[PDB]
Design a protein around this ligand. Structure first.
Ligand code: FAD
Length: 502
């Protein structure tokens, strides 16, 4: 072991290797939960260094945990406990932060540390927008980390993060580390050639091939509008979005992804909708999905309790006081006039009301909605020895569900101090965080709640992935194994075996 570590320090430099528990704690603890021991955290500075570190880990038979930023919410980006059969090496990819724009910006090559934030910035002067907008973009979520988790932001027209074109390393059945270039870009024959070409930014449009594979989720547009389908719009175990790097959850080492970007959206307007009747929001969604020509850009839901705890903008304060259910509907281009006209008519009849945001209201509303997650976490710490731990569920309802707002069995409802509800309303993806009464068996509660969701036909992790909080369905387990036959990369994800060879 003294030798393996010296090799790492030789490959990335001693200032880019951490072994002291007190120093690695920063990378061993999950954003909301999850924690474990790790032998080392290494920070390669080039893709070629990443390759050599992976090779050194495979030859020392270590477990590899790829990490970018670590905003994963279900403990799947940090070690889970200490019972691994081999030492764990966390490879932080955050220094690999270059970005390569292809052509006029219609596609990009993102590297392991490229942040969504930097992607947004580089595309803006090109008149393009990224494929994803998630609550964690403001705190540095990475592009590749979202592809690995099939992340789903607030962007209603884009689907969960997805691409069939990527460059990644895979430990095969024989335990051999292999580099697989499925980027559809000619980069060379050896790892040195391929990775240097990319590290030196010597890729030009001439190296690029155009072949029909998809660099985003095609037709989510269609799937999201099908309000008569009896399955959800998107969920982590959805087999059609599990492709190589897409949904890999750390089971491969993703070096690069080729992704589609989109034309920037014209003139956006946020419509702040509030109501006390769940059915009024249900019909806004159903009518827009079935009848609008223009899909919204975003449609974020916030219940009042989560509103208060997340908590200023006076009109929002007014809406909070008047309405329990809020829908932040962002339209763009023509959808603005379409939404404004239909809402004016709809609310002359339907119970609540709405207003057209001022740039300041609109940004503060979204900033408030995001942060919902951090909220519950902080309410917990405040009331630590008085409430159990936070029970957080991530769910995707059947597209034709007529009752999205849950009415739990009275005996389950009574065990909750608070019920925090927020989500991506148009996609029927909801995050439900509960503050549970002191003395309640949280594990038993969760099990009861998961049974009710199965009964409702919902799927669960929707966007956050299974991590170590959810059991991976058969589709996922089979995918994880195909990618990592030796089970040497982020091992027990989805409550699966943590041991070598599974
Ligand atoms: C406040 C807040 C709001 C959020 N809002 C949303 C939201 O709206 N929608 C949503 O879907 N999620 C949301 N999330 C979760 C977030 O999307 C994920 O935490 C984020 O996408 C993960 O990106 P990351 O850079 O943090 O990756 P990390 O957490 O580091 O996690 C990466 C996951 O991918 C693996 N991985 C990372 N890099 C690589 C690589 N190069 N090769 C192979 N495997 C790799 C890791 O092992 C792990 O399984 C939120 C989290 C927070 C804290």
């Amino acid at each position: 072991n003294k030798a393996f570590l010296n090799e790492l320090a030789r490959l990335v430099g001693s200032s880019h290797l951490l072994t002291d528990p007190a120093k690695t704690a920063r990378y061993r603890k999950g954003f909301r939960s999850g924690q474990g021991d790790a032998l080392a955290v290494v920070f390669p500075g080039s893709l070629l260094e990443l390759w050599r570190v992976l090779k050194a880990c495979v030859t020392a038979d270590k477990i590899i945990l790829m990490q970018a930023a670590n905003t994963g919410l279900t403990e799947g980006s940090t070690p889970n406990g200490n019972d691994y059969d081999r030492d764990v090496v966390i490879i932080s990819t955050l220094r690999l932060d270059k970005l390569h724009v292809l052509g006029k910006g219609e596609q990009v090559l993102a590297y392991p540390g490229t942040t969504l934030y930097s992607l947004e910035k580089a595309l803006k002067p090109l008149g393009r927008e990224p494929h994803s907008v998630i609550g964690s973009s403001c705190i540095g979520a990475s592009v590749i980390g979202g592809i690995c988790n099939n992340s789903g932001g607030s962007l209603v027209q884009r689907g969960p993060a997805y691409t069939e074109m990527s460059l990644f390393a895979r430990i095969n059945e024989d335990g051999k580390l292999t580099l697989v270039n499925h980027l559809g870009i000619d980069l060379g024959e050896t790892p040195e050639q391929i990775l240097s070409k990319l590290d030196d930014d010597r890729i030009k449009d001439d190296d690029v091939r155009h072949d029909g594979r998809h660099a985003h989720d095609y037709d989510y547009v269609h799937r999201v509008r099908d309000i008569e389908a009896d399955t959800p719009a998107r969920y982590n175990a959805d087999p059609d979005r599990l492709f190589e790097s897409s949904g890999c959850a750390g089971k491969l080492a993703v070096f690069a992804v080729r992704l589609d970007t989109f034309e920037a959206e014209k003139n956006q307007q946020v419509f702040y909708i509030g109501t006390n009747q769940p059915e009024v929001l249900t019909e806004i969604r159903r009518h827009i999905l079935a009848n609008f020509e223009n899909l919204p850009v975003a449609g974020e839901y916030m219940h009042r309790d989560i509103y208060d705890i997340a908590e200023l903008p006076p009109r929002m304060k007014n809406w909070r006081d008047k309405y329990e259910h809020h829908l932040l509907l962002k339209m763009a281009g023509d959808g603005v006039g379409e939404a404004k006209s239909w809402l004016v008519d709809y609310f002359k009849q339907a119970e609540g009301d709405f207003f057209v945001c001022t740039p300041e209201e609109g940004s503060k509303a979204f900033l408030h909605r995001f942060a919902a997650a951090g909220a519950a976490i902080r309410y917990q710490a405040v009331h630590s020895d008085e409430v159990e731990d936070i029970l957080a569920l991530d769910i995707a309802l059947r597209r034709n569900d007529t009752e999205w707002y849950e009415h739990l069995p009275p005996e389950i409802d009574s065990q909750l101090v608070h019920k925090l509800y927020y989500g991506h309303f148009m996609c029927y993806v909801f995050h439900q965080d509960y503050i549970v009464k002191k003395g309640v068996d949280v594990h038993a509660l969760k099990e009861q709640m998961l049974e009710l969701l199965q009964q409702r036909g919902a799927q669960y992790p929707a966007e956050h992935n299974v991590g170590h909080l959810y059991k991976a369905p058969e589709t996922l387990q089979k995918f994880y194994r195909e990618n990592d036959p030796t089970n040497s990369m982020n091992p027990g994800i989805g409550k699966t075996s943590k041991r070598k060879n599974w």
